[PDB]
Structure formats: C-alpha cells, structure tokens
Symmetry: D3
Subunit: 237 residues, 6 copies
C-alpha cells in the first residue's frame, strides 16, 4: 500500500488507463473489462483491474491537475510495477480546424506548471509521450475508422486562467488541446523510467463553437477508450 | 450549474469547509451537520449543505493539489455566492518542535507553484489568509482547549519532490506544515474577492517521528472540524 | 557595535520601532519616550532608547528600501538581542475604499524584490508578520477607537515605477498599501528567528485624486505610533 | 534572395536536409544526389539541390547553434516554399545503454535556450518534431535493418558547459543525445507553420570512456542520411 | 521641491557626487568645497552645493541600497537638471589580489536585484557607466599617481547574504567589488537619460575581517574624492 | 588541434579578429595582412594568420549566434594561447539617430540569451568588454578621423524576433546596435580569463529596410577593420 492506493503489488496491471474522473473509471471497468475487481477506493479514487481480450488492464481515476495525477502515476510506477500509463481525458480546443469530438493524441505537452523546471534545473524539459505508444494509438484509431490528430497538448495549472491572451499564443504555436495533466504525467514517466501517453477528446472550443448531445459524447468517449485499449494490444506486438 | 458543480445558487452556504478527500466531506456532514442534503456528486466530489447550531454550512471535497482546489473554490465564489472557504486538511511537518496531531493554522502559504506568479506579473504574491478568519480559528481552538500554531504553510506541487534539500530550507524559514493547496486557495480568494483560511492537522513528520492510532487520528480530525465550525460562529459576531 | 550601529548590547530594548526616516525616530523618542537617550548616529541613522509607561522601548530609522532595512533589522536581531521589530511607516493606496489616514497593518507583504527568492530557492516565500504582534496591534487600535485594516502590503523596489500597470494588478489582488520594506523585514525575521510587524498610515492615493487632508495627518501618524507602543504592552501580557 | 540565402524561389526542393557543417552538405549532395547544383554560398553556408531516386531534394548547412539554424530554417520556410526540414547531425550520449553509432530520432528536444520561452510567454513549450516525419524515419530505418531510438534530445547553447551536473540530470530524465539545434528548429517550424525532424548519430559518449570505433562511423553516418532521404519518399506515399 | 529633496531648480550643480553616507557628503563639503551651502536635509539625507577650483559641484548622500539611491538619483535628474552622477562609495573585495584601500571604477555593474529585469522585459540589461566618465576617472587617477582598477562591480540587495557560494561565482567572473548601488544607478541613468559612474574604495574583504586605522582610511577616502572631482574637471574640457 | 579548429599551438596570433562570416575573414586576410596563411578550414570556418605592419595577427570567422562564437572563442583561448578577441561584425540600429555605416563599440552587451544566467546563478552578469581594448579602439578611430559610438550592444538569439515590442525597450535604454554575439563573447572571456571587444558597423535599421551600395559598405567595412588593427598596435605599447 502507498499513502493514496490501498493495494498490493500485482493488484494493478502493468498498463493503467486513467481518466480524470474516477466515476469514468468505473464506467470503463463495467463497459470494457471482463472479470473486473475493485482495487482502490482511497479518497474515492476508484481503481479497477480486469481483462480486455485476455490482456490484463487496470483503470483508475487521477483527479484534476498535475499535482493530483503526479501522485497516482508515481505510486503506480514505483510500487505497483506499472510500465505504461494512458491518460484518457477531455480537452478544450483553440484551433478553428480542430472540432468538438475530435480525438487528440498528445505526443508532447506544453505547460505553465513549474514541476518540470523543478525537475530539470529550470531549463525546458520537452514533456513527451512514448513514441511507440503514440503510433500504437494512431494505428488503433485508423483500424477503427477514427482519424486522430497528433501534436502538442497544453497542460494548464489554472482552468480559469487570468491570462486570456495565452490561448492566442497556443493557437499560433499549434496546440491541439488544452487539458491539465499530460506534462505532469510525462514528467513523472521520465523521472521514474516508465512510459506514458495522453489521449483526449475535444469537449469544448474556446472560440465559438456549438455543442453536442449526451449520446454523441458517450460514443466518442467509447471510441477514445477503444483506441486506448486496442493501442495496448498493438504495443504487445 | 458550473462545469464541476451540478447545483444552483443557494444550494451552498456562504461558508464552505473543504477537506481534500470527498469521503471526509461526507463524514463531516454526517457527524456535525443537521438536516444535511447532498448538493454535488460530479466526479465523485461529494458536497453537502446543512446547519451547525443554526448556522447554514456547506462541506465539499476539493481534491489534491492547487489546480483541483482552484477550480472548486473559484466556481463556489463566482457562481454560488460563497464568501469564506475553510480548507480543513492534513500536512507534513519539518520543524522538530512541531508534533504529530498538532493543529496548524496557515496565516500564509508559501508555494513552488507558478499560479500566483502568473496572476501577479511574476512578482511575489504573499498568499495569505483572511485575518479575522485566522483569529476566529485561534479563539475557537483556545475555547476548546487546543493550542494551535499560527504561521506559514508550504503548498507543494509535488508530493514526491525530487528536491529533498527544500525541506531543510522550509525548516530554516519556519514553515509549520507542508500541504498542497493553501497558496492556491488564497490566490483564488484574492483574485475573486472572497476570504479563505487553511487549517491542517499534522499527519506526518518528514524527519523521524513515530506514528499514531486510528482513534487518535479521528479525535484530532474531529477537533480540527470543531475548530473550523466554531470559528465560523465567532466570525458572525 | 556592528558595522552600521555604534552601540553595545543593552543599548536597545528587545522591541524596536522603526520609521524609514531617522528624523521621525527622533520625533517619536522625543514625543513618546521618557528618559530617551540617543544610542546610534552612524550614517545619520538615529536610534533612541527610553521608556513608555515604564516599559523599555527603542526607536530607530531603517532608511528607504528593502536592502537598507534588511541591514539594520538583521544587526539588531543578531547583535542587540532585539526580538520584535515594528515598522511604523507611510504607504500609498491603490484600492478605492482605502482612504487617506487609514491605519493599515501588513499581515503579509508582496514584493517585486528578489531577496526572498534568493533565500527560498527561487520559490514563493509568503513574507508574513508575527500573528500575535498583528492581533496585539488590532486590539490596541480598537481600544483607541480605530478600525485598522489588516491585509497585504506591497514592498516595492522602485518608488518611481517603470510602468504603473502593476498598480492595477495590486488593486485587483486586494493590496492595502504600497511601501518599500515590509517584505524585506519579514524575510530577515524569518531568516534570523525573530518577530516583525509593519503598520503604515496611508499618505497618498496613487489611484485618483487624491483629495487631501490637513494634519490631521499628524494626529493619524501619532495614532499609528500609539497603536505600536500599546501593542507592545499587550504583548507583554 | 534573403539576407542569408542568395537564391530564388524554386532553387530549393520543398524538403531540405540540414547538417551543421556546410562541407557535409557538399558531401551529401555529391554522394547521394544526382544532377546536384550549388544554390547558396553566402557566408560559406553551402546549399545544394538535386534528385534522389527522381525526387527533388535539397541539402544545406545550418551552422552550429540555435540562433544560426533558426535563421536558415525560417528563411527557407517563409521565402523558399520549404515544407519539411530534416536536421541530420551528430550528438553526444549520456545514457549507458546508448552506444556510439546508434541512430537517434528527436521526437522532442529539451533545451537550456530561452528562445521558446520568448515565443511562449515564459511557459514551457514542448519543442516536438512532426509525428509523420518521425514515423517515416523509423520505418525507413527498419527497412534498412536499423533500430532507431526515438526520444528526447537536449539542445545546448554551450558546447563547453560551465558545469556538467546537467549531464546527470539529462541522464536521469532519459535524454538520448545532446546536440545544439533541434529545439530551435522545432520552435521555428511551429512559429512559421512547417514540419521538422532531427536525426542524429552518436559521435561521443560524454559519460565514460567512450571506447571507440573505426569509420564504420562513416557508414553509420551514411545510414542516417539514407534514413532521411528514404523517409521523404515514404512521406510522399 | 521633490518628495525627498526640499530644494529648487538651481540649488544643485549639474554634477553630483553621492556617497551612501550623508555624513560623508558633509565631510566632503567641508574638506573639498568652498562656499558650501546645505541644500537638503529631508530625512537627514544631507546635500551640499559649493565649488571645486571654481567649478560648481554638489554632494549628497544616497542611502544604502538600490531602492534608496534610485529615488534620489531619479529626482536629481528629472527636477534639478543634474546631468552626471558620480557615486563615491565603499565596497567589499572577493578577489584575493584586490587589497584594502584599492580604488575601483565600475565600468559595469552586475546585480542580484530585479530592478533592471523589470525595466528590460526580464532579459539581461548590461548596467554600464558612461565611457567618458570612466576615461576621465582613469586619467584623473593617473595624474594624481593613484592605482585604480576598471571592471565590474556587483550590486547586492543583501549585505548579509544567505548564499555564500555566490561570492565564489563573483570571484570566478572577476568582480572587483561588492556594493549595493551601481547597477541601480546605471539603470536610472539609462531610464531617465543622464550619465553615471561608480567609484569605490575597498573597505574590507568579504572573506576576511582585515584591519586598518583612521589615518589611512580617510586618506584613501580622500584619494577617491580627488579622483572624482578632478575627473569632472577633465570632463568639462 | 581542437574539435572545431585543425591547427596547433602557435598557428594563431595572440590576438584574433573575428567576423561572423568566414568569407569576410578571407577578405580581411587578403586585403590587410601580408604573408597570410590559412590555419583553419574545419566546417568551412576559415581562419588566417599573417602580419599587420609587422605585428602577428590572426582572423577567423565565428559563425552566427552566441553558441557558435562561444565554441570558437573558447577553443582559441584554452588551446591556442589567444589573449584578445576582437569581434568585427554588423549590427542593426534601433535608435533613429544611429545611421547606416556608423561604427559602434560595444563596451557592454545586453542579451536575451540564458548563457550568462547559467554562469551567474540566474543573476545579472554585466557582459563587458576590456576597458583598455575599448580605449584603444576609440583612439584608433580618432587618429583615423572616424566617428565611433561607445555603449551597449544587444546580443539577440533570434534574428527573426517574435517580440517586436522588445526593440522599443532596446531603443528606450540606448542600445546602439543589435547583433548576435557580444554578450556571449564577453561571458567566454570572463569564464576562461581572456580579453574581448566587439566592434560593429550598422548595416541596417531594424525599423526600416534602408539602401546603400557595394562601394560604401566595403569602405565602412574597411573602416572598422582599420580601427580594430590600429587599436591592437596601441594596445601593444
Ligand atoms: N484548462 C482546461 N482544461 C480542460 C478543458 N477541457 C478539459 N480539460 C481538462 O480536464 C480538466 C477540467 O475539467 C479546458 O477547456 N480548459
Ligand atoms: N507534500 C506534502 N503534502 C501533504 C503532506 N501531508 C499532507 N499533505 C497535503 O495533503 C495532500 C497529500 O495527501 C506531506 O507530507 N507532504
Ligand atoms: N513604492 C511606494 N512607496 C511608498 C508609497 N508611499 C509611501 N511609500 C514609502 O516610501 C517612503 C518614502 O517616500 C508609494 O505610493 N509607493
Ligand atoms: N552540446 C553538445 N553538442 C554536441 C555534442 N556532440 C555533438 N554536438 C553537436 O555539435 C556539433 C559541433 O561539434 C555534445 O556532446 N554536446
Ligand atoms: N553588499 C556589500 N556592500 C558593501 C560591502 N562593503 C561596502 N559595501 C557598500 O555598501 C555597504 C555599506 O555598508 C560588502 O562587503 N558587501
Ligand atoms: N539580431 C540581429 N543581428 C544582426 C542584425 N544586423 C546585423 N546583425 C549581426 O548578426 C546578424 C547577421 O545577419 C539585426 O538586424 N538583427
């Protein structure tokens, strides 16, 4: 057991899907995993382990923000033998060509957090995904008929930013999605020697846009999770 | 409703107690509040409203880390008419004279987060509590026979810090407790014109120490919550 | 003697009031202290010691700016047995509701200086006053019929600021007054293990217009000094 | 013509290979391109254009360092219709498992430069390659029987580093190679809307000893260039 | 009249010598000038105007630290038509071969203050003296047969520095003397369009606590003042 | 031999002139030296040793940017006994009264590079030329009847800057010319214990795109080279 995960070595798979919302983790275990077992309830951060087409997989919430996901991803890697982390989340879009419900794969993650500067003697650490995990996700997406965009995320510390003009800078430099975690997760992965990917679904456009139905949101969420789960299987080959 | 709180104006009191763990919020509502009603379940971030000696009070989890609590505290202030936030949490101690189970009241909060630099044109924002809220808490504590320490907290972005030497610096400059929120909460309070306090209970000593029993932990947790609730009543006079 | 104070252990009380202006130190000694003797004149930075209602008290100028007041407060603390510093100064207001001749007590002090960053490994140190000293001052002011405002000061390095967009930021984040010392003094106090407080009168409204008073000013100035001295008596018990 | 390239629209292919050394640009043109013509000689920064298996391709030196390669890559992109830049360089290894003559592909590039901070409002920009270009390179290398390592480079401003404690940090965080350009090139590509990739061969092991090879070196260098050119053909479809 | 100088346009010469100590400004007025009249005593910051071999010259204390001297130098430039400022101060040596009582001429000034960063968008402003003023002081010192070193001062905010290791860095980079003003004065001269120079004499070693007497200290204090005044005469031709 | 210079101890003079363009190093060797022999051509960075009125003098390109010239200047100092470096380059003007073809002498160099911050614990290192070298160049220019301004250069990392507003700041603070090297050269000279100066001629205005011809540009290019070489002769006496 670790201070935030009441479990023991072997309760988690070597791959963990992590949505921000622990209620989404439960949904994932019910909908996609066979023979599922609850492995964590500390602080209501529900975590599960089961199988997907024979492959042992875990899914657990990480909570909002770099500091929250940095705790869980760290403890998973150092105490539970976890090798790959796939964040499966939502993000806001700044580019007009990026649409609601697009699947974005974060090969890199910009951030306004200081955590990687603390790690890296105040220089620029390029917070990146594991490349094979990126390609696995792109290929899984293509096999399912979904055309994912690959590029930079921006991991924001402040959801309610006082710096509105920063969204124009994000747009200018090609940022595909704004979320709150990737750069933190990629930093932990590099610190402790494991591998990470963040896949996000565009749930907001910080420009116009219109909005979507609950049936549409569920479909793309399911698509994202299919992409994550199938990407793991490609990775094992 | 706000993107993280499915509720409407008047569902929350103008004062909200916020532990990090939403399961502790439920415990608080059951143990101390009368006529309690659940007002939030979005992402499992359980929130409640009831009364304590006649006074309308709410209690809701904020999750770990500045970015998480910054979302909830912001939405509470701007959309739910909340005026005072009392964080009620745990912290690690660096000073040898500060003991397990001490109640620490954060008149200020140091941080290694960048959020207040983003707010404050990269200068030093002294993240502080509201003074009356501090004194209310000190007086409530004294009336209950608990002798609280008042001073600086340190709000860390990284629970698992790669910068071990920073704990010696914290010790040198008098930091009473290490937690993950206060500076963020105090920043939001200043940004949006409300008032905040963080009270913490020492649950770890990052030096020796020994440890405690579950009965002892529950007692001091209850003491902290009594201090928070009674402080509110002094504040209304 | 230290390189900036030509005096010996015992020549100062264990509490020192400190205006910026050494001429105002003489004003204070002469007006409020009995049996007042001059104890320093190096660089014209007049210091005095006498009694206020039987209690040994010193008053000495600190000069303008963090680097100046950091020298004097340090040497007082480490070489003259001084345990409490009370800065008694002027400040400029940025908030509309803060008026000329309001007494403001600096519970915390923001700054654009780098001194606390140098001390605190480039993180945010919340430069705060001693809590008991703050509440002694509030109570001493209440006994005199004055309602002191307690909150954040801003300690500026540049009196003539290159750009005044920073005043709008100070105003947004609730800064009560702008002066040039508090954050430095609170830093020294934490570095060297003593207690400090800054009390200021509002001399100027940098916002507006700036409609003026008489003197009047001088009676409000005397009220600040009386608050300081009476707060010391409260602190003694 | 631009201030650093004496050539006209059409003189370059829409893809440019770029070594640091202009003498190596001539090596590449001469060895790998048919019908190769020199298209630039301003400041001795030789550029050439010819064909590789019927495909129009250019190769031109960029000089050592971010500021040098930022000039050439920008002018190529905005004035010569260039859509893809492939840096083909050397780098120093810090990881034990990374050997002399490993081909490393810079999916991301860390840096101690300030150029991306200047672009990105002092936040962390993750300087990344174009994903498709990265996977074209990996596949081109696999077809040639080479197992390219994909990960982070470090783009240093100081070849002769003031202190080498930074190499241990690079090693802890999984940096595959140290060179002087990639982060700058990836920044320009994102600023001006083009695509870029850095491929390097390991010329040195800054860690150890550093036991040596023959040339051999030169055949691994030719493999890098063949990977680059073949990746372009894959990218064309 | 300005907020810190009770005097009028004409009371000061167009050149002002400024020691930190106002009492040394007095000694200079007594010892070197004739028809010396006091033109300022606000806050005890004594200023004098007189003549040196018939040349109108002023001399006024600036207080300790960047913020203090920035106030007085600014006011002198904007409201009293002062064109040139010559600081005549003490400094500490960090180089073993710079001996007590050496005269140092600050052609540049390093600093750990943030004031020039605030002026210069957080980039490196090289805080430099006026070249002709530097040349004049080198020639005045030659003509009087006095040894004088030209190079970098370091202007510190903390006389009592918590970072002793920084002195090794100053040593490493050839810093001739550590004082508390020059970089601030040179930034003010640049901002408000005047000219400045800092001359200092080494009154101790940071490393040691080495010994002299009141005969030599004043004769060397007098050497610096002669250089300064004679350098002005040369500037006039 | 060093990694970027194929030559041996003795092949260079103790003084080296360095333009950025190696082809201008060639023109200088042809036009001004006698018995000129090529001593370096690695990476095409042409270096020549010869004599000027019997004085042994070398001249070698340094490439564009701080990182490039830091490599070559370091190697020259540590392995070829070079004592003095004189950069002879072009710059852009930001002051309207600094005209095309003006000669500028960089007594100091501002920068937006991080290299000196890395050397100087993130404080402000005033990057300065050697005073005697500056004096020699002022006197050489006087004796040849050439106008020459002394003050601050700004050494930029981005020739193509995304922050146009910074040019207004450079203007505000008297920056005489914008180039890409001086601050880096002056930092190298300080770190490795040699002497340096940067002289430049203004080849355009950042603001405008103003016009000249090949007759005047070379005659002014020649003016700067004469100053540099004659300044060395003066230094020898
Ligand atoms: N900052 C930010 N984070 C987001 C957005 N959408 C999703 N995330 C990341 O999820 C955490 C917030 O619910 C957005 O629009 N902005
Ligand atoms: N960084 C840190 N945060 C703590 C500690 N104890 C409590 N907190 C704050 O609570 C969030 C982590 O569970 C501690 O020891 N270190
Ligand atoms: N920076 C600043 N300092 C002040 C102000 N008012 C008083 N002080 C303190 O400086 C005292 C010297 O005038 C103000 O408006 N700004
Ligand atoms: N900074 C750095 N650059 C390198 C290294 N190896 C190759 N390069 C790229 O510089 C090419 C010029 O030698 C290295 O070990 N460090
Ligand atoms: N910071 C610093 N300043 C000095 C020293 N010596 C002289 N000065 C100049 O100002 C300090 C006045 O006491 C020193 O040793 N350190
Ligand atoms: N950054 C910059 N450098 C210049 C300019 N003019 C000359 N230099 C010196 O190096 C640039 C060579 O093209 C300019 O306008 N900007």
């Amino acid at each position: 057991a670790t201070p935030h995960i009441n479990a023991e070595m072997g309760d988690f798979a070597d791959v963990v899907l992590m949505p921000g919302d622990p209620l989404r983790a439960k949904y994932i275990a019910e909908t996609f995993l066979e023979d599922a077992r609850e492995v964590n309830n500390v602080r209501g951060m529900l975590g599960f382990t089961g199988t997907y087409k024979g492959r042992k997989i875990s899914v657990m919430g990480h909570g909002m923000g770099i500091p929250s996901c940095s705790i869980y991803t760290k403890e998973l890697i150092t105490d539970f033998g976890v090798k790959k982390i796939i964040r499966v989340g939502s993000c806001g879009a700044v580019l007009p060509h990026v649409k609601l419900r697009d699947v974005v794969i974060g090969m890199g993650a910009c951030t306004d957090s200081k955590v990687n500067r603390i790690r890296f003697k105040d220089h620029d650490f390029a917070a990146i995904a594991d490349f094979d995990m990126v390609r696995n996700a792109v290929d899984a997406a293509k096999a399912l008929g979904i055309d994912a965009r690959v590029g930079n995320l921006f991991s924001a510390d402040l959801f309610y930013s006082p710096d509105g003009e920063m969204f124009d800078v994000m747009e200018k430099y090609g940022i595909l999605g704004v979320e709150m975690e990737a750069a933190g997760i990629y930093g932990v992965a590099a610190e402790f020697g494991a591998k990470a990917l963040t896949i996000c679904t565009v749930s907001d456009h910080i420009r116009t846009h219109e909005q979507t139905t609950a049936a549409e949101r569920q479909t793309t969420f399911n698509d994202m999770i299919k992409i994550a789960l199938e990407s793991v299987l490609l990775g094992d080959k």
